[PDB]
Structures are given as structure tokens and as C-alpha cells.
Symmetry: C2
Subunit: 111 residues, 2 copies
């Protein structure tokens, strides 16, 4: 992949990246490639739309520890409000959601 121009640490600092846990996954009722994903941050939950249906079955996602951007502005995706986004690596062959390497408290901040 291509090398990017350099940015400030302060640009990374703008993101509120957190560990969450997937609680429920359903097909997006109007978009065949998308899931509606309910993520727990502990005492809060967020509902996101993710383009993961081609890569993960719904039962492979339940209980998964994931990483989300927690201060993303909400967006309407074909009738569903998405409150954030999950992070996943992609090399064109596979898509790999990011995870902490240990169970850690939900809502933990990534830094």
C-alpha cells in the first residue's frame, strides 16, 4: 500500500477509539452487503452499519470484541442510522476486524 504524508499525533488524538463487544447482528433490511450491528461499551450501546456480511456470518460476530470510533457523527444508510464504525484490516483477500489481544473491560480507550 502507498505511503502517506505525515500528520500530527493531535490528528490521531481527535478520534475516540474504544473497545466494544458485539451484542447482536442483523441483516440491513434494505442493503444486501450490510449488517446492523449493536455494540456494547459497557453501560452504553451503539448501533452501527457495517459492510461485513460478505466476510462474516452473523453468528461469527456475536460476542466478538471489536474496536469502534465512538465520536463519529451519525449517518443515514438506506433508512438506518449508523452511530459509528468498526475498524478492520483488508488486503483484498480477507477482512480482519481489529480486537484487543485479551478480554479487557468494555469501553476501554485505545491509545
Amino acid at each position: 500500500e502507498e505511503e502517506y504524508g505525515l500528520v500530527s499525533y493531535l490528528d490521531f488524538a481527535k478520534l475516540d477509539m474504544r473497545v466494544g463487544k458485539i451484542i447482536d447482528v442483523q441483516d440491513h433490511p434494505n442493503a444486501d452487503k450490510l449488517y446492523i450491528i449493536k455494540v456494547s461499551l459497557g453501560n452504553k450501546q451503539k448501533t452501527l452499519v457495517g459492510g461485513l456480511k460478505q466476510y462474516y456470518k452473523k453468528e461469527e460476530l456475536i460476542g466478538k470484541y471489536v474496536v469502534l470510533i465512538n465520536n463519529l457523527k451519525p449517518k443515514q444508510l438506506r433508512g438506518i442510522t449508523s452511530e459509528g464504525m468498526l475498524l478492520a484490516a483488508d488486503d483484498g483477500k480477507e477482512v480482519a476486524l481489529l480486537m484487543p489481544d485479551k478480554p479487557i473491560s468494555l469501553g476501554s480507550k485505545v491509545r
Copy 2:
């Protein structure tokens, strides 16, 4: 654009080049007793990082670990050693958990 205060757009994330890498070497920082010098492979380039992981991970447990690197940060000199990036880790104040892809995907894979 209109001020958004504490909220970000996708473009604020897209500014950051986040990659999967693999740790290929870990050494003690010669001027800082809590820090490691960590060499991370992106496949056909490597980056040298300084990480405060010595209190949480043994060197031999980091070798071969698939990690998540911010790959386009400005460099930073930490007590004589230039760090070229940073690894992402979850921290709840009790425990530190490096992020990893959930499978050993190709080195240099970009996060989206």
C-alpha cells in the same frame, strides 16, 4: 467546514494510515528503563518504534505478534531514539491489551 466540536467525520479517520504489522525485534531502550525499541515489519518496509510496553509484555511474547501501527505520524525523539510510529493498545487503567487483527492478514494491510 462548520465546527463539529467533539465529533469527527470519516475524513478525520482517513487522514491516519493505520496498518497491520508484525513485531520482528524488541530491545531495551538504552536510556529509558520502562521502554522498548520495537522493529515492526510491514512486509517490504520496516519501522522503528519506541513503546512503553516493558511493564506489560515480555520481549519474547512480542516477537511475531501481529499489531496495529499508525504509519504516518510525524517522528518523535524519545531520550535519544527516534520513534517512527505507534502501536495501538487498549488500556482500562488495570490492564494493557495491544490491538491485533483477528486473523494473521498480510503485512502492511490497511485498516478501513
